């Protein structure tokens with residue numbers, strides 16, 4: 001059986017998985033139960049010497065997405081979404097869920113000093129677990145190309161458990177509990193990965209969707225000071241769909257609103273100390289109360305009930321202002337998107353069919369946007385179906401007269417155009433950006449949000465050369481071109497720089513393009529980012 005040593009020298013036993021070695025379910029924090037609910041994680045101090053870690057531990061409590069894909073999608077599109085496992089609750093789950101897992105090449109010794117790819121799963125900040133989105137394919141490919149890496153994944157609290165907000169949470173300084181979980185795991189890696197054969201100074205953090213936004217957050221965490229024990233917690237970052245979270249502070253309007261609902265539904269409305277009452281709830285009651293707020297696939301959609309919010313200390317301010325003001329770590333980065341990020345989410349408002357309904361929907365989703373700003377917005381994103389997402393599909397995929405429009409808007413604000421704003425202001429290091437169109441032609445969704453997960457962890461596709469090969473090269477040499485791809489990946493400086501600045505993917509292979517599309521939408525959304533925060 002494979003073995004490894006921890007920071008204090010304790011020895012643990014792993015699992016020989018034939019194609020790789022795994023150390024699963026390692027506790028990195030005291031169970032965030034009872035009194036510790038909503039609070040940052042406390043490091044685990046009990047000795048693990050002589051123990052075995054051959055199985056995943058449970059995921060953190062999961063919030064039902066409240067969506068319905070197998071009711072609106074045709075077979076081929078549905079099959080791919082299911083294969084990606086995106087937005088699917090992970091079982092079993094429990095509040096005692098803060099474990100970390102390590103996957104390494106077989107025969108890896110403590111002296112290997114391999115680069116470490118620290119993965120942050122994405123599940124809309126309301127569900128998900130480290131057990132899904134397997135790193136096996138990444139590791140196998142790193143070995144095949146002679147640039148072996150160690151894959152690390154951690155669970156972090158989601159929904160109310162990890163992102164409860166409101167005035168009480170803020171006054172206590174407990175905003176963004178789930179992000180703290182991720183932060184502690186990163187510190188855990190700094191202190192323990194060497195004993196598994198990894199090099200703590202070669203950590204590349206990466207994530208998809210909520211995990212990509214989390215990765216970005218880690219760049220601006222504590223205003224860009226990512227040092228721990230005197231050393232950077234990571235040397236690079238990869239963002240697969242998402243960066244800045246367009247959100248108001250912890251004690252803002254919607255955070256307080258969602259909090260009041262949880263408190264009321266849990267039977268704590270008459271408590272003199274609301275937080276203490278919530279902390280004294282059975283696991284089931286807190287779960288039920290949480291189930292009484294909207295899930296990610298429900299009508300409010302990307303107006304998430306739970307998501308990272310500026311707290312003033314760890315995420316000190318409006319995340320868009322953080323990047324403009326340079327409060328970030330200086331590391332090279334890769335950040336890309338799937339051509340049609342918003343299709344999955346647009347499926348949550350198929351009852352919005354008229355221009356008037358669309359306007360009403362945007363107004364309720366963006367409580368800070370004036371009528372004038374909404375006008376400009378609806379002029380940038382028209383009802384002309386040929387201009388919506390799936391992009392460049394003409395009259396096709398218009399399941400409703402507004403689906404392609406709403407999809408385009410939501411995908412751009414949450415992912416694609418937000419990325420351009422990040423790239424335009426970020427000067428922390430060399431930047432590389434990609435835009436996938438690998439699934440062009442796929443009815444209804446197109447190259448949808450999360451499809452990269454399939455080609456990164458389950459199947460080999462044209463995009464795999466990027467999600468695997470290029471990413472591994474980046475984690476190894478801080479340059480995706482060391483992957484030896486037959487198409488050079490140009491560096492990105494600004495959305496108006498000369499020539500092609502995006503590595504792109506089609507059904508067969510690679511090519512490059514320009515990040516110059518939908519400019520009026522970019523200006524309509526970001527002339528004042530806060531007007532479109534949730």
Ligand SMILES: *[C@@H]1O[C@H](CO)[C@@H](O[C@@H]2O[C@H](CO)[C@@H](O)[C@H](O)[C@H]2NC(C)=O)[C@H](O)[C@H]1NC(C)=O
Pocket residue numbers: 294298299300349351352353357
């Ligand atoms: C589309 O359907 C959603 C889901 O039912 C509607 O949202 C609900 O509307 C009712 C009545 O207006 C509210 O009491 C609920 O709180 C809403 N639920 C959610 C998920 O927020 C929405 O109004 C419909 N939109 C249109 C254009 O008809």
